[PDB]
Structure formats: C-alpha cells, structure tokens
Amino acid sequence: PLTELEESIETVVTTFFTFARQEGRKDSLSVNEFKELVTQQLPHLLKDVGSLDEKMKSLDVNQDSELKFNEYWRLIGELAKEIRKK
Amino acid sequence: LTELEESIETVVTTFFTFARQEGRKDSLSVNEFKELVTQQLPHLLKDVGSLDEKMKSLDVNQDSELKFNEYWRLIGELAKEIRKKKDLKIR
Ligand SMILES: [Ca+2]
Ligand SMILES: [Ca+2]
Ligand SMILES: [Ca+2]
Ligand SMILES: [Ca+2]
C-alpha cells in the first residue's frame, strides 16, 4: 500500500472529489460544496477565514463560479505555507 | 484535526523530518531528498529515473537545496497524477 506521505497526498486529492460530486459538475466545487468542504474538513485551518462567499470569489481565479481541482490545490498550498511557518 | 487537516499536516511535516538531518535545517540537500523519495515516495515516484536529475529539475534557483516551495511543487506534480486517477475519462 501507500506510505504515510503518499496516503496523505491521496487523501488531499480524494477530499476534493468527495465534495465536488455532490451537485452539478462532478469535477468542480460549487459555492455550496466549497462551504461544505471548509466547514466539515477545514474548520481548524480555516477558523479565521471570515466570509466563505468572499473566499470562494478569491479562489475562483477564472471567475466561472466553481472551483476546479487547480483552484482547490491553490487553497491547499496557502494552508500548507501557513503550517510551514510554525 | 479532521482527515483533511491531518493529511495536510503530514505533507508539511514530512519535509522538515528529512530536511533537518544535515546542513540547512529548512531545506533538503540532495542526500536528504533521495532519502525522502526512497522512504516516503517510493510508489508515486517509482518511475522517476535519475534522482540526481529530478533534484536538479526541482531546484529551480540552483542553490543545491530544496526549500519548502520547491518540495511543494513536487507534491503538486504528484497530486495532479492522482487527480487523473480519481477522475477517469471513459472516452
Ligand atoms: Ca460539483
Ligand atoms: Ca473557477
Ligand atoms: Ca537539510
Ligand atoms: Ca533550491
């Protein structure tokens, strides 16, 4: 099977698709799916994020009202880079 | 921590675990990078070829070290290949 690091990378990727398949396109997060992912799975790392509707807008870099995997990955990188600082 | 948060913490911590071994404690020398790949990415980087060449390719500022940003670009490469398998095209 996978190492601790490999399984962790796989979990990060799987979590996107778990949330993205709930409604509309199965390969992107709507605002509702993004809000679910944050509230369910990032309640600690995003505790101080403020308005989720604004954060969605900020991450939606091509202004199509959905987060594709690349845009979610940008969020993961932001969270990683904050953790690194500790 | 949630499953997702634990996983992001693991990805970050694994870097420092290998980086603190010798030299600058916040970067991977080529020896520390080879240890990380062999011990912790043996499957995802099974087909990577020369580790010394991979190190060079990841060492974007040619300082002979991988700082966290440079390791994170590797994790992104690996994540994109996983993404392909978690969203298969029937075509
Ligand atoms: Ca969706
Ligand atoms: Ca978008
Ligand atoms: Ca080092
Ligand atoms: Ca470097």
Side-chain angles (χ1 to χ4, degrees), chain A residues 1-3 5-13 15-24 27-46 48-52 54-56 58-73 75-81 83, chain B residues 1-2 4-5 7-8 10-12 14-19 21-24 26-34 36-45 48-61 63-66 68-72 74-79 81-83 86-88 90-91:
Chain A
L2 287 176
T3 63
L5 173 58
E6 291 170 332
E7 200 175 63
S8 293
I9 306 165
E10 179 187 59
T11 295
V12 168
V13 182
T15 296
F16 177 82
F17 290 102
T18 295
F19 288 85
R21 70 172 48 101
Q22 298 306 307
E23 63 181 32
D27 65 349
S28 75
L29 294 169
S30 66
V31 67
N32 301 316
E33 294 171 324
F34 168 67
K35 291 181 172 176
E36 286 299 337
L37 190 150
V38 168
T39 69
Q40 293 185 40
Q41 286 291 325
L42 298 169
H44 308 107
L45 297 180
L46 281 175
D48 292 322
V49 70
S51 170
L52 296 183
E54 309 306 332
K55 186 66 168 172
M56 176 77 179
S58 184
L59 294 167
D60 173 26
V61 298
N62 39 53
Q63 306 134 3
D64 70 359
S65 309
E66 303 260 336
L67 302 192
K68 286 189 207 166
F69 179 76
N70 58 3
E71 291 161 324
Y72 163 79
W73 188 253
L75 172 66
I76 304 306
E78 143 195 343
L79 295 183
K81 292 175 177 166
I83 287 162
Chain B
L1 292 192
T2 65
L4 180 58
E5 294 175 327
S7 282
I8 294 169
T10 292
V11 172
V12 178
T14 305
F15 176 84
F16 291 100
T17 290
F18 287 85
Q21 300 301 338
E22 61 176 17
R24 305 183 191 170
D26 65 341
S27 67
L28 297 165
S29 68
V30 57
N31 289 358
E32 297 164 328
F33 171 65
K34 285 176 172 197
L36 197 152
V37 172
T38 303
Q39 289 182 36
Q40 284 294 311
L41 300 172
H43 310 100
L44 297 185
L45 282 176
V48 78
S50 160
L51 291 171
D52 295 274
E53 287 291 323
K54 193 44 175 187
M55 170 79 186
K56 190 166 179 180
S57 172
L58 284 173
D59 177 18
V60 304
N61 74 342
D63 67 359
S64 317
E65 303 281 329
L66 304 189
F68 182 90
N69 70 300
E70 288 167 336
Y71 163 84
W72 186 254
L74 172 67
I75 306 292
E77 177 193 329
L78 298 184
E81 294 301 339
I82 300 171
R83 177 211 80 70
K86 300 301 190 187
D87 191 14
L88 288 174
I90 307 325
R91 84 173 296 108

